[PDB]
Design a protein around this ligand. Structure first.
Ligand code: HEM
Length: 116
């Protein structure tokens, strides 16, 4: 997708998320009520240290799942529907209460390029 446009679309994510490199460099200074999204491409779902996730997203990483750009793009359009489908569980719940109407792919490409 497009990284430069996804950078501008991350203005919907920064209200709960930041993007902080391991030495502390703040690539995006945002909030702290969602987890750090630096290196989230390729990382096991629900394992970022010192963050209390809801149980479904943890069970999703406990089965082997690591995020990809394409899964980020779909999850961000409707996080609770994503979780219900992958876990095959109607009761799957999510704490991320925000659905991105368009721009999933671009934000996803922007998150992969930020470590690079
Ligand atoms: C399009 C913008 C956003 C993107 C790209 C995004 C991306 C993500 C991703 C990729 C995860 C899973 C992280 C992991 O497994 O470590 C996540 C989790 C989460 N996000 Fe977002 N997020 C966005 C907007 C938001 C907003 C606006 C909020 C708050 C209103 C939010 C709150 C959270 C929370 C609380 C979690 C943990 C989910 C859980 O425990 O169920 N996110 N987000």
């Amino acid at each position: 997708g497009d990284a430069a446009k996804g950078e501008k679309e991350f203005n919907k994510c920064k209200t709960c998320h930041s993007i902080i490199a391991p030495d502390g460099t703040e690539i995006v200074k945002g909030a702290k009520t969602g987890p750090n999204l630096y290196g989230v491409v390729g990382r096991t779902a629900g394992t970022y240290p010192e963050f209390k996730y809801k149980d479904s997203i943890v069970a999703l990483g406990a089965s082997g799942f690591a995020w990809t750009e394409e899964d980020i793009a779909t999850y961000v359009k409707d996080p609770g529907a994503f979780l219900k489908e992958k876990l095959d569980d109607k009761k799957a719940k999510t704490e991320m209460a925000f659905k991105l109407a368009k721009g999933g792919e671009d934000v996803a490409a922007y998150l992969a390029s930020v470590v690079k």
